[PDB]
Design a protein around this ligand. Structure first.
Ligand code: OGA
Ligand code: MG
Ligand code: NI
Ligand code: ZN
Length: 331
């Protein structure tokens, strides 16, 4: 078995190997990359996502979210408070202000310590889930706006044509902006490109050990657990690496820098934080190996997790028994 310790693997494809996305994902998995739940892909040196980032300031962040924490430093939840619209230019100015900017630090490890020590005492503002793309339409390789769609993958594997579309999303982050512990909708893959700015640190649990994370989470967030059998779908719970180590949860960590891709694999729980002002683009995708994860994915039916138009069809076809109860939560 390849990668039996489930380490995060880093890949350095050539420009030739960067031509066929599907085939490269399949190559990574042949080397055991999926076992970690997350891989890093450094693009060939000849590759670029677009020519410059000089003209992005007029993108609108219609609903910036202030991330308010409750709990203790190592075990907390966050809620998202809606703020007034601002432009990327305005957001970047806010991210760089004395109130929100990254503090002095020695190295990524010192900054990670400061994050976990201090995150709960601040409320950073996140421009998340903004439909759109920063890839130049003439970038042909690993252009997240030109990937094959999940609906076409389901049609190719299973023979059923379904409604729905699949498009990318932009994330504008600042120091301490946080992504809570989650797997993707319907335990899909995700791919994330860090277009510009400061780094993003990631934590991940190997898919084969996901249930151990879930069990710890039910212990650490007992009222949430009673309210919903899949409450990590709410994307509100954080658990520090210290707390995971104390409870014997296997995980790994890695820092993504501007110009690098990350791929999360089906049922790979992940969480993390941004180091300072940055802009990432991400999209879900599927392969033939996803299908069986899609069939088994947990669902939130308490009604909190409230998800896309396109997830309907996935649940309808892959999880017909759940469909009924899940759509009652969605309506
Ligand atoms: O970049 C972020 O805030 C979070 N992204 C993801 O969880 C992802 O790409 O799967
Ligand atoms: Mg602009
Ligand atoms: Ni994710
Ligand atoms: Zn729920």
């Amino acid at each position: 078995a390849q990668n039996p310790n489930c380490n995060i693997m880093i890949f350095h494809p050539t420009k030739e190997e960067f031509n066929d996305f599907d085939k490269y994902i399949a190559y990574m998995e042949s080397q055991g990359a999926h076992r970690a739940g997350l891989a890093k892909i450094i693009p060939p040196k000849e590759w670029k996502a677009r020519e410059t980032y000089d003209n992005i300031s007029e993108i609108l962040i219609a609903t910036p979210l202030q991330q308010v924490a409750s709990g203790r430093a190592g075990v907390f939840t966050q809620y998202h408070k809606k703020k007034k619209a601002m432009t990327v230019g305005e957001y970047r100015h806010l991210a760089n202000s004395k109130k929100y900017q990254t503090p002095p630090h020695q190295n990524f490890e010192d900054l990670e310590r400061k994050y976990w020590k201090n995150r709960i005492y601040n409320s950073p503002i996140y421009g998340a889930d903004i439909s759109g793309s920063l890839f130049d339409e003439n970038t042909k390789q690993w252009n997240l706006g030109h990937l094959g769609t999940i609906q076409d993958l389901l049609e190719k594997e299973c023979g059923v044509v379904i409604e729905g579309v699949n498009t990318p999303y932009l994330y504008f982050g600042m120091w301490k902006t946080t992504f809570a512990w989650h797997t993707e909708d319907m335990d899909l893959y995700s791919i994330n490109y860090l277009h510009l700015g400061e780094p993003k640190t990631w934590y991940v649990v190997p898919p084969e050990h996901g249930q151990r994370l879930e069990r710890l989470a039910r212990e650490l967030f007992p009222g949430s657990s009673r309210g919903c059998g899949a409450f990590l779908r709410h994307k509100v719970a954080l658990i520090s690496p210290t707390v995971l180590k104390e409870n014997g949860i296997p995980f790994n960590r890695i820092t993504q820098e501007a110009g690098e891709f990350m791929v999360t694999f089906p049922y790979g729980y992940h969480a993390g934080f941004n180091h300072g002002f940055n802009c990432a683009e991400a999209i879900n995708f599927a392969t033939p190996r996803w299908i069986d994860y899609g069939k088994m994915a947990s669902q939130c039916s308490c009604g909190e997790a409230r998800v896309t138009f396109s997830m309907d069809a996935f649940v309808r076809i892959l999880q017909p028994e759940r469909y009924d109860l899940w759509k009652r939560g969605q309506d």
